[PDB]
């Protein structure tokens, strides 16, 4: 996250970090005790990818951290139906053993298709991660967050040569300087409603982070809420 601020412990208790052949390479969010939602581009491979819930500072021990192995990865069936589009950039990860929900490990709420879109359209959400703190720069040690404004679709369309689908949205500041960045991908875009946070997007992609006239691109979660619900049922 470029130009954000340190989260406090337990401020985003649905946030997780993904580790593998690279540490902290992507974020995700807790759907329930057994399931994480993330970006499919993060998990095109699975070799001992590990999830850490209850994380705050990546170089220290807080004694809130819950580490789990991923046993199953389900990318959206239509992801990679079209080469290099990032269309349908969402995936589910099933954990080997359930998380123990507590104040530092709590799911994000997921509303139905209609209300996720309503909540998105409220026009302000929070984004968080341990991604780069400057474009082409280093990664964050303490979890970062940032309020990003929703950007109107026509503006976003003009901001890039790349295709922006109906399954995506843009968010950010016209002046640049503050943005999501690489390493943040897969993490939550969330909208707080009377103190309860709902998942409204997945941090997906972008061009140079925080550059004026460029915006973060997010997966429109409303389009995928029925699929998430269907896949992540507990028995």
């Amino acid at each position: 996250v470029v130009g954000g601020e340190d989260a406090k412990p337990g401020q985003f208790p649905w946030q997780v970090v993904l580790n593998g052949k690279v540490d902290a390479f992507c974020g995700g969010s807790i759907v329930n005790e057994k399931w994480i939602v993330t970006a499919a581009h993060c998990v095109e491979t699975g070799v001992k990818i590990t999830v850490v819930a209850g994380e705050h500072n990546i170089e220290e021990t807080e004694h809130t951290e819950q580490k789990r192995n991923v046993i199953r990865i389900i990318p959206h069936h239509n992801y990679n139906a079209a080469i290099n589009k990032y269309n349908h950039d969402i995936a589910l990860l099933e954990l080997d053993e359930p998380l123990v929900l507590n104040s530092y490990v709590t799911p994000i709420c997921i509303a139905d298709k209609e209300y996720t879109n309503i909540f998105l359209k409220f026009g302000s959400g929070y984004v968080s991660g341990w991604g780069r703190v400057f474009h082409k720069g280093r990664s964050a040690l303490v979890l970062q967050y940032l309020r990003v404004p929703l950007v109107d679709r026509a503006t976003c369309l003009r901001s890039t040569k790349f295709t922006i689908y109906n399954n995506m949205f843009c968010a950010g500041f016209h002046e640049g300087g503050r943005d999501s960045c690489q390493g943040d991908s897969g993490g939550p875009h969330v909208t707080e409603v009377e103190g309860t946070s709902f998942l409204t997007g997945i941090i997906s992609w972008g061009e140079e982070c925080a550059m004026k006239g460029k915006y973060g691109i997010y997966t429109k979660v409303s389009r995928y809420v029925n699929w998430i619900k269907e896949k992540t049922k507990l028995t």
């Binding site: 337990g10 401020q11 208790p13 929900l101 709590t106 709420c109 509303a111 209300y115 946070s197 709902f198």
Partner: protein, 57 residues
């Protein structure tokens, strides 16, 4: 009442019903209060809420 105006006063979700509309509802982990509008935690760690004190010092 309609869902049109201030979400039928529903804390979370609103659906229009015959004329005297508004039936409010809540997401998993919450229950509709007797008050019929607000949403009460029905579990120890309900989704989407911060429970670690953020005001420290």
């Amino acid at each position: 009442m309609t869902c049109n105006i201030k979400n039928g006063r529903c804390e979370q979700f609103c659906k229009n019903s015959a004329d005297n509309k508004v039936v409010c509802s809540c997401t998993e982990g919450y229950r509709l209060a007797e008050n019929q509008k607000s949403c009460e935690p029905a579990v120890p760690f309900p989704c989407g809420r911060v429970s670690v004190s953020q005001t420290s010092k």
